[PDB]
């Protein structure tokens, strides 16, 4: 059993991005496999590991792995100590004496972590940093600019108490509204701007789920599922429009083939992960495919010749096919390697 | 190291459903984590576990779990003995004496297994039983089940003798379905397309049987079956959609087919992704073969000239069933996740 004692502070009560700093550090430490005890004055319990944080601190590092005794530091600051169970036979109720004694007794290296010391003045800074910590793998210059463009939305939704599931669902309904209503009507441009607007909700729900500590398998599932639904709806709309009012059967056929191939490309990865093996490899990514399809469709909606769309649909189809082939090949390799 | 000694016989060399009985028992014992030694006369080696099979026997039980010393029996028959390492200090070179002495020394309980004693006369029977043990059929009458196994015995024999792999069967079958769906249907031949698809559809059951029979049960097999099954169904709906959007001149049917295509993809993806996440969802009102049956029968009927609204109705009902299936799966995985946090 691992125990972590954190000292109470005045600033731990402040609310940051929907949680308090106290609950946030507590849940953070919980993610590290520690049972958290808040203390004004320490009463030690029998256990194996002891992680002692004194000064108020915001830990920005996502995965913290603590193995063996050591000292926790950020930019010259000492944020906390990690002592083993032996320290229970040391601590006499005086802090510095027991610390310096355990340090004279034990030789410990220094471990670098991503953290910021809390102060009343730098809270804004802390918030900014916290926002920056959520990112990746993202777009690195572009990533920095990126955090800047999606930071206010995440901040706003976090402050209003909006859940990420709500965001995912609303976004998908928006995409469905653009794809299944405007497109069959023959409005390709406005449909495209609606879809494009409500598509970034995937990245939004990821930031909010990460920010609010909710995460989980359900979260991952929902993002993936609704993402699939979204793409399928987009292609469905294209297919419908060009089969009827668009009066272009060949585009409609290519779009339909792309719909099916998309479903199959997603299903390959999903089913593979289901068998316990893995396949992340493919040339075609959801956002890139989305981008080319949306840009082409929008262009055609502004009057660009439809053969551009024909070409892009051909290329996307072929890319989906070779991606499928790649995935099937690597899962084959994995299986045959697993049997041996 | 675990050792299993099986005594050599004249009939072990005979080939049954593509393998010899000898290789079959050896590979069976290999699946149990045993190193197999075939012997005309026993030479014992130092080891931990000793599994001794004397009489020629075809073991029909799939998973055999052996923990601790015990006696192996099938329907009153005693098929073999399981002795520990101590038996190395017993065997003096006589078989019967050391076995009966060790049986007099040690009290071992009796474990029931599914197996059949080999004889020259009953070979046909054995073949039948093995076949019957390998094939599943969902919700089939025991008469219907017997009949079904009876109709696939010649097929299994033929494919086993010709050297055809189960992968070959799955792929060929899927190509057949695709040939029916993406060629005949867009041409406007719904009936013949339907008969092509219906003919090449049973290949799923065939590849399951062959993969089980030839002992290739691995993760690759499951992957390939699932994937090509998805490809097949998607191709079927794709064909329907294409035909009815252009020459079939029925936009509402085409739309219903497209919606069903998407919902099908989503219903499958739900299960695949759920399993990927480590949770499970086997629950839904709709099963693949039943859906296949109603769709194919309706489409074929329309292809023989029956009015297309029948197909419209069946597509609506199938759509709704897919939707509620989606609800069940999403709801239960939600329940599981929320239950997992608690
Ligand atoms: C004039 C005519 C021109 C017409 C205009 C047409 C413009 C078309 C542009 C297309 C751009 C859209 C591309 C979509 C990107 C995407 O979705 O990628 C998702 C992609 C993957 O996101 P993801 O799979 O959802 O990850 P993430 O959301 O973080 O999920 C991870 C965690 O999220 C948690 N989670 C999620 C949801 C939930 N309910 N609970 C959870 O717990 C889970 O626990 C997971 O662990 O992210 C990206 O890579 C972002 C790419 C950046 C694209 C931005 C380009 C901006 C350019 C502006 C162009 C405007 C043009 C206007 C000109 C006029
Ligand atoms: C007059 C006009 C009338 C018009 C006529 C229209 C009538 C059409 C009738 C359609 C009936 C088709 C139903 C079968 C559907 C199917 O495929 O089952 C899937 C399903 C196959 O499931 P599956 O997923 O393939 O299981 P299985 O084959 O064992 O695969 C599992 C293992 O197989 C391994 N494997 C598989 C492939 C591989 N390459 N390697 C492997 O290792 C993997 O490792 C897996 O572990 O079959 C069933 O289980 C259900 C029972 C079959 C029901 C039979 C219905 C008969 C009705 C007769 C009607 C005829 C009408 C007469 C005409 C007049
Ligand atoms: Mg998302
Ligand atoms: Mg996503
Ligand atoms: Mg099969
Ligand atoms: Mg199958």
Author numbering:
A (entry chain A): -137 to 1, 4 to 204
B (entry chain D): -137 to 204
Can you quote the paper on this entry?
In the initial step, phosphatidylinositol-phosphate (PIP) synthases generate PIP using L-myo-inositol-1-phosphate (inositol phosphate) as the acceptor alcohol and CDP-DAG as the donor substrate; subsequently, the terminal phosphate is removed by an as-yet-unidentified phosphatase to yield PI4. We have determined the crystal structures of PIP synthase from Renibacterium salmoninarum, in the apo form and with bound CDP-DAG to 2.5 and 3.6 Å resolution, respectively.
In contrast, although crystals of RsPIPS-FL only diffracted to lower resolution (3.6 Å), a structure of the complex with CDP-DAG was obtained readily. A unique feature of the structure of RsPIPS when compared with Af2299 and AfDIPP synthase is the presence of a hydrophobic crevice between JM1, TM2 and TM5, which in the structure of RsPIPS-FL accommodates the lipid substrate. This groove is directly exposed to the bulk lipid, providing a pathway for lateral diffusion of CDP-DAG into the active site. The nucleotide is wedged between TM2 and TM3 in a pocket, which is also lined by TM1.
